[PDB]
């Protein structure tokens, strides 16, 4: 319904700042790319833009479709997951970051991904790097979400596998060996 960063209403925007976030309410499809850069939480001193309130990211909970790629390089320190995208389902990825990645979660303090509704990733690779607190990512079977032969996943430089098992942050006994987006029995992809 609405465009993405760099297209249309976001012609001269590099990320989702406190100026253009108000245009995503009741939007179900993004016709472009979504950039979540660190400028959204440290603010912009040049434009006097304050940090986006961490309770304001719940506006994107109506999003279900992204034609381009989703680039997440920042997240509020108060939120442990990404359930602001708990209803996002499809990332087509006709346009990619450097022509390779359609989903990038880089250096976040999140404890879980929480992309529970994400069922399809049409085209593009998925890189998950630099997240010191993240879990559940290495258990997700990304072959279910893929649609193009050869889509790769880089789960690198993140929290150790035995580190998540030490805190009991694994998938529930009530779901398949396909993975989970969190500890709750609802985050499980299949059962």
């Amino acid at each position: 319904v609405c465009n993405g960063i760099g297209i249309g209403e976001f012609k001269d925007s590099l990320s989702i700042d406190a100026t253009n976030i108000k245009h995503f309410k009741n939007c179900t499809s993004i016709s472009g790319d979504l950039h979540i850069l660190p400028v959204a939480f440290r603010g912009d001193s040049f434009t006097h833009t304050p940090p986006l309130d961490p309770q304001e990211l719940d506006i994107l909970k109506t999003v279900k479709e992204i034609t381009g790629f989703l680039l997440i390089q920042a997240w509020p320190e108060n939120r442990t997951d990404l359930h602001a995208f708990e209803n996002l389902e499809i990332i087509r990825g006709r346009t990619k970051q450097h022509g390779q990645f359609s989903l990038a979660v880089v250096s976040l303090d999140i404890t879980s991904l929480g992309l529970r509704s994400l069922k399809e990733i049409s085209d593009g690779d998925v890189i998950i790097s630099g997240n010191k607190n993240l879990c559940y990512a290495n258990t997700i079977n990304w072959k279910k979400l893929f649609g193009t032969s050869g889509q790769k996943t880089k789960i690198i430089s993140n929290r150790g596998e035995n580190s998540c098992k030490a805190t009991g942050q694994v998938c529930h006994a009530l779901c398949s060996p396909e993975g989970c987006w969190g500890p709750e029995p609802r985050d499980c992809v299949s059962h």
Partner: antibody
Amino acid sequence: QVQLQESGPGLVKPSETLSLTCTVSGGSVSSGDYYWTWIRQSPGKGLEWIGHIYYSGNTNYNPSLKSRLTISIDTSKTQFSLKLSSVTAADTAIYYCVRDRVTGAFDIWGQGTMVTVSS
Amino acid sequence: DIQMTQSPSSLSASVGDRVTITCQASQDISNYLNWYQQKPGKAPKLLIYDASNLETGVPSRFSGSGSGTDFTFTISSLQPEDIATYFCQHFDHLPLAFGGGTKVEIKR
């Protein structure tokens, strides 16, 4: 292309703080595609990954040096520094500042600086 | 706490010989494995990333292979300029670590 260069004292007294600064030339430290990393090498420990910092401010430290480590970034003069407090003779090593791309590779290394811990 | 073991610790070969060194990880690291070359007195140089891909500018006589725990680095035709110590490095999860290194020398 992009070159890295180390700077800092070569002799640090024990129990004090080692300080080093890497100046990036021919590029900017403001790219979200790289982790700006410090790496040291010594006889007995070999190549050891100290830690890196992102341009968002997020840091990742080696648990063996976590308690005494602090890495910051100054995008103004395109630099990022290293601070290692309470040093002992075990910290005597050659220290490199390295550009680690998020893809996962130490593609650009500095020339390396020698740091000696001794009274 | 991934342990990287390189083998051998040192070797000697003639010019034009095929050199093959191995790197073994204590756990499955997929293909998150890189190879570095450190010539005497210089900083390490990246030659192979993602176990198999050749960095641009590196001669074609260098290659890498492997996935999981066992990896191999191969020099098809050894040259006198290849005198260096070769390291393998993983990036599966934090913290990142290097191998012990493999010193390569020329027999003449």
